[PDB]
Amino acid sequence: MSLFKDDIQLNEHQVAWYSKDWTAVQSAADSFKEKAENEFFEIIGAINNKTKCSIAQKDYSKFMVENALSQFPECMPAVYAMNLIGSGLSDEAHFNYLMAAVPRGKRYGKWAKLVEDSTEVLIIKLLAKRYQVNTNDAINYKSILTKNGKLPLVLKELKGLVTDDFLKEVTKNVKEQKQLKKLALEW
Amino acid sequence: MKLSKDTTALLKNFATINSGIMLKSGQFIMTRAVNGTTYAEANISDVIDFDVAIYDLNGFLGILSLVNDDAEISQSEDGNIKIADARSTIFWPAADPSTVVAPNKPIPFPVASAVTEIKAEDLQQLLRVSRGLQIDTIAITVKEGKIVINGFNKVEDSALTRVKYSLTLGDYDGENTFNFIINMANMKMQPGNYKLLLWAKGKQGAAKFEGEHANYVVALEADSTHDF
Amino acid sequence: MKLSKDTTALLKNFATINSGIMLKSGQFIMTRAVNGTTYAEANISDVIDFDVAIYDLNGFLGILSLVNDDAEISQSEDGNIKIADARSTIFWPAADPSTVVAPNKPIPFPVASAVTEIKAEDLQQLLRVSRGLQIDTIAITVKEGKIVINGFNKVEDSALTRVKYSLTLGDYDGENTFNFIINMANMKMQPGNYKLLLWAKGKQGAAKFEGEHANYVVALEADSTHDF
Amino acid sequence: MKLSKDTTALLKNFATINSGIMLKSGQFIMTRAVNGTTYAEANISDVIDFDVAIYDLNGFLGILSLVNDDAEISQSEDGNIKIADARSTIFWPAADPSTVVAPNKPIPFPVASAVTEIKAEDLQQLLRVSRGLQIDTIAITVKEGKIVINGFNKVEDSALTRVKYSLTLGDYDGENTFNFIINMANMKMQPGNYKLLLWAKGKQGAAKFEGEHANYVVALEADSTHDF
Amino acid sequence: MITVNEKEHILEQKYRPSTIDECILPAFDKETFKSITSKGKIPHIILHSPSPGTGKTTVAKALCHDVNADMMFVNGSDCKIDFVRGPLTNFASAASFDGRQKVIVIDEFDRSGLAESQRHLRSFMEAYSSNCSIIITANNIDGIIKPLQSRCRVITFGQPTDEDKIEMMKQMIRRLTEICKHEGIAIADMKVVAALVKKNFPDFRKTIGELDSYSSKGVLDAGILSLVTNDRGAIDDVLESLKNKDVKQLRALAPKYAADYSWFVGKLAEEIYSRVTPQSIIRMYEIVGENNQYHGIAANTELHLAYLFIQLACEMQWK
Amino acid sequence: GAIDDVLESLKNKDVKQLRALAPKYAADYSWFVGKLAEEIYSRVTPQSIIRMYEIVGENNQYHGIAANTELHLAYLFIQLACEMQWK
Amino acid sequence: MITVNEKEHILEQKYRPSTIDECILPAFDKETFKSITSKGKIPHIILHSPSPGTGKTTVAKALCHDVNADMMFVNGSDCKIDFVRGPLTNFASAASFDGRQKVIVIDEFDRSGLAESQRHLRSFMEAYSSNCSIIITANNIDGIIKPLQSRCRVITFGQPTDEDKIEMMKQMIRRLTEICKHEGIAIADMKVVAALVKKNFPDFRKTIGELDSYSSKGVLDAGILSLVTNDRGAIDDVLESLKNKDVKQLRALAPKYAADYSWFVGKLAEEIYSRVTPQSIIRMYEIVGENNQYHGIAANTELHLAYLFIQLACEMQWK
Amino acid sequence: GAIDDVLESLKNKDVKQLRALAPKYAADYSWFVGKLAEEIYSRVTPQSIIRMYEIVGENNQYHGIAANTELHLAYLFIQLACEMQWK
Ligand SMILES: Nc1ncnc2c1ncn2[C@@H]1O[C@H](COP(=O)(O)OP(=O)(O)OP(O)(O)=S)[C@@H](O)[C@H]1O
Ligand SMILES: Nc1ncnc2c1ncn2[C@@H]1O[C@H](COP(=O)(O)OP(=O)(O)OP(O)(O)=S)[C@@H](O)[C@H]1O
Ligand SMILES: [Mg+2]
Ligand SMILES: [Mg+2]
């Protein structure tokens, strides 16, 4: 508890850099990370209502953008085309195509939902894997646990079988590490 | 100056506390963690003849190891350290004194409320087990009239109720009860026999490990009591 | 128990096969890989005196190493392992037997169909070459009346026809010709003079290395062809 | 062949210089960096009695060290190298000579523009300090009538004016001023007493280290200035 | 008398018959299964049942447990090419020396997209028949390729008799009472359990699932009889949403059926064919075929299915 | 080895039977596609042989990226049934 | 008074300005830079140059030299996380015993992957703000994270103000003439220098590069200097071939790029973006993505590139 | 290899020879496809050059996933023959 009564403040960045606590330095640097909600809101706003937004440092997620734009059938053909052929396109190229294709509108993303709705397929998949039941029975079990059984309680132990090899079948890419940490803490 | 192998080893051990050490003219070397939680000091056998601040003590000692013991460390023209060997000269950049956290004056430790002793083997085993068992914190408590260092994994159990490792130091002559908590991240003492002597007045306390070479002082966590 | 240095080394080697071990009240410790491909067993001099299932054998052995050689392990009041020492006392969580995969009973390896022998230096050379030569499959076949432990690369040599390594273990006096394809990931035996005595029946086969400390029973790959 | 320990060490050093090597019949082994910056050659006491182009020299030496010292290395039916121990027989492919970059013939070094001696201890100290002090470029210029090697950290300052480490080699006789810049990534010479023979004409120069066993040649950086 | 895993929170995989005797089965089926278990061997059997839910997967697992075999429980969906040539072959070949027989239970080996998996399993069983026995489990027998039928002896569930019907009903009512007592659920009326079991007698998995879903209230109220539920195989929700053309629900329902695209597209082409105008049947096959055609080049299958749903909704003439 | 039933059902233009029998003939797709091409070429009008080639070639080339191969074969059968005449 | 580096093989680095005064810029921007230097201490600055080629690296180095700061130039792409944690901290925490401010000049910091390093450098500026001042140079200000712009003061200078435009036109013509005279190239055509200045005026880097390219053969300074250019470009030849619709060149060069299709396809998409129209861009992205999806499915990989080129040429309505 | 037979077959627009010779190239696809694409250019109408390139490129695109390679080459042959602007 600071043996020394130093008048130097060491404002949470001096302590991280002077002490060479590279973990603390990384935490301090991430302290300037814009929360994903507003980054995604800006990206989807640029895509939906044509706006001068550039993604160079933004953590652009192809899957998040596609499944937040697919809620609307108006911009479904663009999402479908970038689903078929988007894989392999540079994130900038994917964003440019979505900008040029997605016609216009506001669409009111509601990022709070599409984050959980994007994990529904993964939950069904690993719940059918753990219980060795078909995906229909997996969704039935998921619905049952939401009411009785405390689905989080099951997921606490279920997290142990989300292997790096298992996630490959859920989606084919290297950004699948997002749900690795997402399901790394499910409690 | 000249840095003997003993002084260089002591400085190398200190480098684990503070990445940089503000050396000062004389025979005293002392370093504090940037957090201020850990303090270390020692009386060296060499003579530091100029006040220089080093922002990378590990690298400085790595360079010192290459040159022979005869190497004479002298301040360069532009203030940089200059390890001058018999045939090779090495220039080391002296850090900016602002960018190296060092104590202004030595920590004068008051009279210890409880004075104990820790054996070198016991302390080494404690340090190794801490890594082995994931012992985030410890507690120098009294159990059945003896001083015991109980290690807990504070990340798992926050109440500090399960002792994943218990070390008995000796019989407590006094009659006071305390639960001094010392985080394992602040246990940077080098191997050796340490006469750790605790102290806690009010809500502020500190544990000092008076060793043969260095005298480390560790800030007791906020959950230590020693209510007397 | 006592878990002398020899038993600790045997368990450390076993941890390679299975992350956890289910010890039982006796002088016999046995383990098998999760997929069941490899089985290991051995008679330990030290006497195990309580059924304790350890989920992390590597970590338990690491903690045991930092304790005195005569660290009297014991069952804790909670039901976990208590590695008592002269002064210290380390507590390890004895996971439930359900989560620890160990064989139900010792494997009664049948009469060997083709007994052989592998020298310690030969086995050490076979493992090092496989690690460095990209080998990940060995076929213990017979060639010119001598048993040769070929080496292949199933990743690239799918048919296993291009030999990368050869090792003439000895001469086979029988008439049966066999090509026992053993995976390298299942060759977890510790260094030592082994006596591998193969066995095959129809599409099911096994290869058992019986050393002077532990006996390792490996499962022949699906492609092992033979005429027994 | 019967490559001995010293020949294997020399080939390991060359693999350090170049990822692969191109052995040729006779008693001469030479290799050149991929980009041609550094050229290395040496005479050996073992006879390379067949021309092979090992695409991964480091891995080949690693595999060769796993057999007896008298492993009768030869060439297999497919032309691939076939190490043959007493019992084992490794098979190492011999890549096509086109893939592995090698020199057309031994590099004839012009007359020694300057001659200097760098001791083994001095060379090891220079290399270790360069790894430590972050030195990445050394100038072999002459200062105050003596030839010294100055270490410059190009990354921090492209203008080589801030010297990080100065090594005094020996007395300089000639009356020519020169500052040869040698990249530290091209100093792959093994420890030993070398016989630097600096040479440079116009805008192109090259320095050769007349080693006891090997003769390393390094291409001076284009930034080098001199009166040659 | 009643087994409990205590590690399952589902209440359907938690209270499931661990032994064949505990299973509620017709006298004839139970006697045949007891004979099979008493023979000490498990020949390749395709467990069959007309009415789904009569407990055939549980019966297969009970057979494996009673024989003490080293059962390898594998779904039909994941019994793909590599799995048949990989883990299945490794399990069948690797010979544990405990004397336990090896049995490979294969659930639902009759789904749509399992055309070639059945043939590959037939080849495997031909290769590895003498070591490990395969216990298939299919709802409709015709979904299993004809060659595979000959290898394994078929057993049919169902067809309970009047005395069998009454005995099974009483047994399941008693089992429901025991489960409710063990689960801390108070049943308001004893007749409630009997009525619930009578509502869906031929299958008991549906009854256990309804009880598990209703357990939120903690009491088996009379409202449980009002829980219509839905047949697991049926996809009537997709068809109704397509008819109503509510793309807002098709998009939110696509993830449900996107886990197993092959079976779902098979079922969609199977069912939407008999409830659309013949002129639009050609276009339905065009759309579903084009969508199926591109699955494999599509990164995310859920969006693929959502697009298929919107296209079908906007381009379907419903008769 | 015999696909006369598929050809007969296709000639009758009974989409129900084609789809019903597709699952059993979808286990082997390359062989069946080749056989269907040969018999359709021998049993179709010269003008429609190009149409059969286009249909079967598209359908087989898109194979491998077909999520449900039985539905893929049923799609092939429907396309052939409603898009070609028979000699 | 042109400052010659005298140690580079490129004219641009050979004759790069050594100070703000000898830097030729719009009057307002030059006055602002002069005031910045006159204040003595160089604060955090982001040099924003919307028009490429105007020179922001030169202005940053000129500021550092003019204020006598201890410049440490690091290329933006080379300012990885490890570089910030290592050399940057080592420089910022070194005793400045000469009174020279330590100034880090992170050039072209608005790159693609430079986010975890940009925010890391923002934290750095939080720590070593009183030890070293950072002067970031970015072409696209939107490419620099928001905190780095809230801390550093963004400066934009690529907008000549008419009369300042003409003044700096004459200044640039005189400077180019002097550099040509010093190099050893006679000014054969007086109109050629002005024409080259006009052709790409706010691209001084490109103009100097072209002058170097055409000065190698001889003094010249006439003809092709003011007539078009000769830059081959990484993929500019293929872009021109596609624009011309030539087919022989496309097939001829397809094997050249077939060695590493991924990098070439990405570069092709990036370049063709800027030369097409919204419908054209949609079609181009669909074409490139579809072709790339079948890289591992293409029979050879060279006819694949040829097919991509043919598709683009047929569909790409260039603008 | 031989490509003259296939080019002449395309020129005369035969249908039996294309099928017969298709299995002779299915063993190695990429080599034959590249060779055919190279040869066809010198003997195709300038406007039909683009069509030939597009057809060959599409077929090359969809190989690897094709279930039946031989029928894959056959389809290529009829596609080329039916709409080849021979010059
Ligand atoms: N005869 C039975 N006796 C007791 N419980 C049963 C019986 N049949 C099913 N169950 C219950 O149903 C669950 C397991 O049944 P399953 O056999 O898996 O259902 P199912 O036969 O697979 O239905 P389908 O055809 O797969 S939809 C457990 O909760 C069992 O308690
Ligand atoms: N305003 C200017 N005055 C004088 N020389 C200039 C000017 N702008 C550019 N140059 C020349 O351009 C060369 C250096 O260009 P830089 O700006 O340092 O490179 P840069 O980083 O690519 O700048 P860009 O392309 O505009 S982002 C030198 O030869 C300079 O003399
Ligand atoms: Mg079932
Ligand atoms: Mg720039």
Short mmCIF file of all heavy atoms in Angstrom, two decimals, chain C residues 119 121-122 125 128-129 132-133 163-169, chain D residues 59 63 66-68 78 85-93:
data_model
loop_
_atom_site.label_atom_id
_atom_site.label_comp_id
_atom_site.label_asym_id
_atom_site.label_seq_id
_atom_site.Cartn_x
_atom_site.Cartn_y
_atom_site.Cartn_z
N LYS C 119 17.02 -51.94 -27.25
CA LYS C 119 18.02 -51.43 -26.33
C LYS C 119 17.70 -49.99 -25.93
O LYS C 119 17.05 -49.25 -26.67
CB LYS C 119 19.42 -51.50 -26.95
CG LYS C 119 20.07 -52.87 -26.90
CD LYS C 119 19.16 -53.96 -27.43
CE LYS C 119 19.95 -55.17 -27.89
NZ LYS C 119 19.07 -56.28 -28.36
N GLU C 121 19.67 -47.35 -25.64
CA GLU C 121 20.24 -46.38 -26.58
C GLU C 121 19.47 -46.37 -27.89
O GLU C 121 19.26 -45.31 -28.48
CB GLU C 121 21.72 -46.69 -26.82
CG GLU C 121 22.01 -48.13 -27.19
CD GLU C 121 22.30 -49.00 -25.98
OE1 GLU C 121 22.49 -48.44 -24.88
OE2 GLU C 121 22.33 -50.24 -26.13
N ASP C 122 19.06 -47.55 -28.36
CA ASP C 122 18.28 -47.62 -29.59
C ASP C 122 16.95 -46.89 -29.45
O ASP C 122 16.54 -46.15 -30.35
CB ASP C 122 18.05 -49.07 -29.99
CG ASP C 122 19.25 -49.68 -30.68
OD1 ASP C 122 20.03 -48.93 -31.31
OD2 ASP C 122 19.42 -50.91 -30.60
N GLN C 125 17.58 -43.14 -29.38
CA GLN C 125 17.92 -42.70 -30.76
C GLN C 125 16.64 -42.66 -31.60
O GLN C 125 16.48 -41.71 -32.40
CB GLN C 125 18.95 -43.64 -31.38
CG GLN C 125 19.55 -43.11 -32.68
CD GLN C 125 20.02 -44.22 -33.59
OE1 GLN C 125 19.45 -44.47 -34.65
NE2 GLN C 125 21.07 -44.91 -33.17
N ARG C 128 14.60 -39.53 -30.54
CA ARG C 128 15.21 -38.28 -30.97
C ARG C 128 15.10 -38.09 -32.47
O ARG C 128 14.79 -36.99 -32.95
CB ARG C 128 16.67 -38.23 -30.52
CG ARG C 128 16.86 -38.31 -29.02
CD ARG C 128 18.32 -38.53 -28.68
NE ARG C 128 18.54 -38.57 -27.24
CZ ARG C 128 18.28 -37.57 -26.41
NH1 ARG C 128 17.79 -36.43 -26.85
NH2 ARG C 128 18.52 -37.73 -25.11
N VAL C 129 15.35 -39.15 -33.25
CA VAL C 129 15.23 -39.05 -34.70
C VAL C 129 13.80 -38.73 -35.09
O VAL C 129 13.55 -37.85 -35.93
CB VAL C 129 15.73 -40.34 -35.37
CG1 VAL C 129 15.46 -40.29 -36.86
CG2 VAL C 129 17.21 -40.53 -35.10
N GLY C 132 13.18 -35.17 -34.58
CA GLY C 132 13.91 -34.29 -35.48
C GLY C 132 13.79 -34.61 -36.96
O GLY C 132 14.03 -33.75 -37.80
N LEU C 133 13.42 -35.85 -37.29
CA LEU C 133 13.35 -36.29 -38.67
C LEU C 133 11.93 -36.27 -39.23
O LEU C 133 11.71 -36.72 -40.36
CB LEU C 133 13.93 -37.70 -38.80
CG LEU C 133 14.25 -38.20 -40.21
CD1 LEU C 133 14.93 -37.11 -41.02
CD2 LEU C 133 15.13 -39.43 -40.14
N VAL C 163 10.47 -45.22 -46.38
CA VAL C 163 11.07 -45.30 -45.05
C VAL C 163 11.99 -44.12 -44.83
O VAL C 163 12.82 -43.78 -45.69
CB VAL C 163 11.83 -46.63 -44.90
CG1 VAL C 163 12.81 -46.81 -46.03
CG2 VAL C 163 12.56 -46.66 -43.57
N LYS C 164 11.86 -43.47 -43.67
CA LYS C 164 12.73 -42.38 -43.28
C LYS C 164 13.78 -42.79 -42.26
O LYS C 164 14.79 -42.09 -42.11
CB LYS C 164 11.91 -41.22 -42.69
CG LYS C 164 11.31 -40.30 -43.73
CD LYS C 164 10.56 -39.16 -43.07
CE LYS C 164 10.03 -38.19 -44.10
NZ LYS C 164 9.33 -37.04 -43.47
N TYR C 165 13.49 -43.85 -41.50
CA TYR C 165 14.46 -44.34 -40.48
C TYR C 165 14.33 -45.86 -40.37
O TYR C 165 13.23 -46.40 -40.59
CB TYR C 165 14.21 -43.66 -39.14
CG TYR C 165 14.91 -44.30 -37.97
CD1 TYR C 165 16.25 -44.08 -37.72
CD2 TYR C 165 14.23 -45.14 -37.10
CE1 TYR C 165 16.90 -44.66 -36.65
CE2 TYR C 165 14.86 -45.74 -36.02
CZ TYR C 165 16.21 -45.50 -35.80
OH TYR C 165 16.84 -46.08 -34.74
N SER C 166 15.44 -46.53 -40.03
CA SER C 166 15.43 -47.97 -39.85
C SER C 166 16.27 -48.31 -38.63
O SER C 166 17.22 -47.59 -38.30
CB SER C 166 15.95 -48.70 -41.08
OG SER C 166 16.38 -50.01 -40.75
N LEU C 167 15.92 -49.41 -37.97
CA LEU C 167 16.60 -49.80 -36.74
C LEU C 167 16.48 -51.32 -36.60
O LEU C 167 15.42 -51.83 -36.23
CB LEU C 167 16.00 -49.09 -35.54
CG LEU C 167 16.88 -48.92 -34.31
CD1 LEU C 167 16.20 -48.01 -33.30
CD2 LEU C 167 17.20 -50.26 -33.69
N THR C 168 17.57 -52.03 -36.91
CA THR C 168 17.56 -53.48 -36.81
C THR C 168 17.61 -53.92 -35.35
O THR C 168 18.70 -54.03 -34.77
CB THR C 168 18.73 -54.07 -37.59
OG1 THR C 168 18.46 -54.00 -39.00
CG2 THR C 168 18.95 -55.53 -37.20
N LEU C 169 16.44 -54.16 -34.75
CA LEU C 169 16.41 -54.59 -33.36
C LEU C 169 17.08 -55.94 -33.18
O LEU C 169 17.83 -56.15 -32.23
CB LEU C 169 14.96 -54.66 -32.87
CG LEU C 169 14.16 -53.36 -32.85
CD1 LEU C 169 12.68 -53.66 -32.79
CD2 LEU C 169 14.58 -52.50 -31.67
N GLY D 59 19.13 -28.94 -39.76
CA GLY D 59 18.43 -30.17 -39.44
C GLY D 59 19.25 -31.41 -39.75
O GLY D 59 19.23 -32.39 -39.00
N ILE D 63 20.33 -34.28 -37.08
CA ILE D 63 20.10 -35.71 -37.24
C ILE D 63 21.42 -36.48 -37.21
O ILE D 63 21.49 -37.60 -36.69
CB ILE D 63 19.33 -35.99 -38.54
CG1 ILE D 63 17.86 -35.58 -38.38
CG2 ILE D 63 19.44 -37.45 -38.93
CD1 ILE D 63 17.18 -36.22 -37.20
N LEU D 66 22.85 -37.52 -33.81
CA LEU D 66 22.10 -38.53 -33.08
C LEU D 66 22.61 -39.94 -33.33
O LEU D 66 22.00 -40.90 -32.85
CB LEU D 66 20.62 -38.45 -33.43
CG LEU D 66 19.90 -37.20 -32.92
CD1 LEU D 66 18.47 -37.17 -33.42
CD2 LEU D 66 19.95 -37.15 -31.41
N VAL D 67 23.70 -40.10 -34.08
CA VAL D 67 24.26 -41.41 -34.36
C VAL D 67 25.70 -41.45 -33.87
O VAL D 67 26.20 -40.48 -33.30
CB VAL D 67 24.17 -41.74 -35.86
CG1 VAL D 67 22.74 -41.67 -36.34
CG2 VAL D 67 25.05 -40.80 -36.66
N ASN D 68 26.37 -42.58 -34.09
CA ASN D 68 27.76 -42.71 -33.68
C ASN D 68 28.65 -41.75 -34.47
O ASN D 68 28.32 -41.33 -35.58
CB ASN D 68 28.24 -44.15 -33.87
CG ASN D 68 27.95 -45.02 -32.67
OD1 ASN D 68 27.60 -44.53 -31.60
ND2 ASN D 68 28.09 -46.33 -32.84
N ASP D 78 18.26 -43.15 -54.57
CA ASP D 78 17.65 -41.95 -55.14
C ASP D 78 18.59 -40.76 -55.13
O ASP D 78 18.19 -39.67 -55.57
CB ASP D 78 16.38 -41.60 -54.38
CG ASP D 78 15.43 -42.77 -54.25
OD1 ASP D 78 15.82 -43.78 -53.64
OD2 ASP D 78 14.30 -42.68 -54.77
N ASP D 85 24.42 -45.86 -39.24
CA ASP D 85 25.05 -46.19 -37.98
C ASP D 85 25.27 -47.70 -37.91
O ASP D 85 25.12 -48.42 -38.90
CB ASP D 85 24.21 -45.67 -36.81
CG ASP D 85 24.96 -45.67 -35.50
OD1 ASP D 85 26.21 -45.69 -35.53
OD2 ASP D 85 24.31 -45.65 -34.44
N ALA D 86 25.63 -48.21 -36.73
CA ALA D 86 25.83 -49.64 -36.58
C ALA D 86 24.55 -50.41 -36.87
O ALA D 86 24.56 -51.42 -37.58
CB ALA D 86 26.34 -49.95 -35.17
N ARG D 87 23.42 -49.94 -36.33
CA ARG D 87 22.13 -50.57 -36.53
C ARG D 87 21.15 -49.69 -37.30
O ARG D 87 20.56 -50.14 -38.28
CB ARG D 87 21.52 -50.95 -35.17
CG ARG D 87 21.93 -52.33 -34.68
CD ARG D 87 21.70 -52.46 -33.18
NE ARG D 87 22.45 -51.47 -32.43
CZ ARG D 87 23.09 -51.71 -31.29
NH1 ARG D 87 23.09 -52.91 -30.74
NH2 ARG D 87 23.74 -50.71 -30.69
N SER D 88 20.98 -48.44 -36.87
CA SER D 88 20.02 -47.56 -37.52
C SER D 88 20.54 -47.11 -38.88
O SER D 88 21.71 -47.30 -39.23
CB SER D 88 19.73 -46.35 -36.64
OG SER D 88 20.91 -45.62 -36.38
N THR D 89 19.65 -46.50 -39.66
CA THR D 89 20.01 -45.99 -40.98
C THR D 89 19.05 -44.85 -41.31
O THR D 89 17.94 -45.10 -41.80
CB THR D 89 19.96 -47.09 -42.03
OG1 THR D 89 21.11 -47.93 -41.90
CG2 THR D 89 19.92 -46.49 -43.42
N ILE D 90 19.48 -43.62 -41.06
CA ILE D 90 18.64 -42.47 -41.37
C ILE D 90 18.70 -42.17 -42.87
O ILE D 90 19.65 -42.52 -43.56
CB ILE D 90 19.05 -41.24 -40.54
CG1 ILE D 90 19.00 -41.57 -39.05
CG2 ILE D 90 18.16 -40.06 -40.84
CD1 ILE D 90 20.31 -42.00 -38.47
N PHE D 91 17.65 -41.51 -43.37
CA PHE D 91 17.54 -41.15 -44.78
C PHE D 91 17.23 -39.67 -44.86
O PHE D 91 16.11 -39.25 -44.54
CB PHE D 91 16.47 -41.99 -45.47
CG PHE D 91 16.89 -43.39 -45.78
CD1 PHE D 91 16.49 -44.44 -44.97
CD2 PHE D 91 17.69 -43.67 -46.87
CE1 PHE D 91 16.87 -45.74 -45.25
CE2 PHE D 91 18.08 -44.97 -47.15
CZ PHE D 91 17.67 -46.00 -46.33
N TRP D 92 18.20 -38.87 -45.29
CA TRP D 92 18.01 -37.43 -45.40
C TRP D 92 18.01 -37.02 -46.87
O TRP D 92 18.96 -37.32 -47.59
CB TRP D 92 19.11 -36.68 -44.65
CG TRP D 92 18.79 -35.23 -44.45
CD1 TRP D 92 19.10 -34.20 -45.27
CD2 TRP D 92 18.06 -34.67 -43.35
NE1 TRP D 92 18.63 -33.02 -44.75
CE2 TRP D 92 17.98 -33.28 -43.57
CE3 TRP D 92 17.48 -35.20 -42.20
CZ2 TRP D 92 17.34 -32.43 -42.68
CZ3 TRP D 92 16.84 -34.35 -41.32
CH2 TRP D 92 16.78 -32.98 -41.57
N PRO D 93 16.97 -36.33 -47.33
CA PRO D 93 16.90 -35.97 -48.75
C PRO D 93 18.00 -35.00 -49.13
O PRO D 93 18.46 -34.18 -48.33
CB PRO D 93 15.52 -35.31 -48.88
CG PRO D 93 15.21 -34.82 -47.51
CD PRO D 93 15.82 -35.81 -46.57
#
